[model samples]
Target: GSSGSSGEKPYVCQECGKAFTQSSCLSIHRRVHTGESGPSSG
Candidate 1:
């Protein structure tokens, strides 16, 4: 499988070393640290 040039993930997760191209994805990744979902607040 070839990852396209545009598929590069620039956003790096500070905690896990996962990379996402969008900030929204990074925000979702933060859930692993905080354990709190935004609207649900659980």
Candidate 2:
């Protein structure tokens, strides 16, 4: 492991530089770039 790394959250966002261990969460997060979602799904 490396210093200052949170370690296990390897799934990262290429667009916003955030991290998530949940696979589905990032797909919803990515809609920020599209404005295609509201308080619901696409």
Candidate 3:
């Protein structure tokens, strides 16, 4: 049986060593490296 083999792996950053389930989350987290004009805070 196959099950656990397939999973939504998180993207870890070498600098931050943070884990993000979504790649977009990883991309958003990358703002620390440099600003890329993302969703501004309100």
Candidate 4:
């Protein structure tokens, strides 16, 4: 086996371009765009 592109990230945020290995985390991260929970990215 080769290590070629194994380090590449799988998930990406459409809003801010943040990357995540797991879709579950990405799902939670998407809340950043909804402004429903937590503070702003600023």
Every model: Cα RMSD to truth: 7.5, 7.3, 7.8, 5.9
Q: Of the pair 3 and 4, which is ahead by TM-score? A: 4
| Model 3 CA deviation exceeding 4 Å by range | 1-10, 34-42
lDDT of 4 at 42: 67
lDDT of each residue in 1-42, candidate 1, tens digit only? 766577366667766466764667887677666643456653
TM-score of each: 0.38, 0.40, 0.40, 0.41
Give the Å shift of residue 6 in candidate 3: 8.4
Worst 10-residue stretch by lDDT in candidate 3?
1-10
**Top lDDT: which candidate number?**
2
For candidate 4, the lDDT comes to 0.66
Candidate 3 displacement at residue 9 in angstroms: 2.3
Q: Which stretches of candidate 2 lie over 4 Å from their true place?
A: 1-10, 34-42
lDDT of 4 by residue, 4-40 (tens): 5664556677676677756578877776676444466
**What stretches of model 4 exceed 4 Å from their correct place?**
1-9, 35-42
Backbone clashes in model 1, listed as residue pairs: none
Which pairs clash inside model 3?
Answer: none
lDDT of 3 by residue, 1-42 (tens): 346664555567767466775677777777767633446765
- In candidate 3, how many Å is residue 10 off? 5.7
TM-score (C-alpha, index-matched) for candidate 1: 0.38
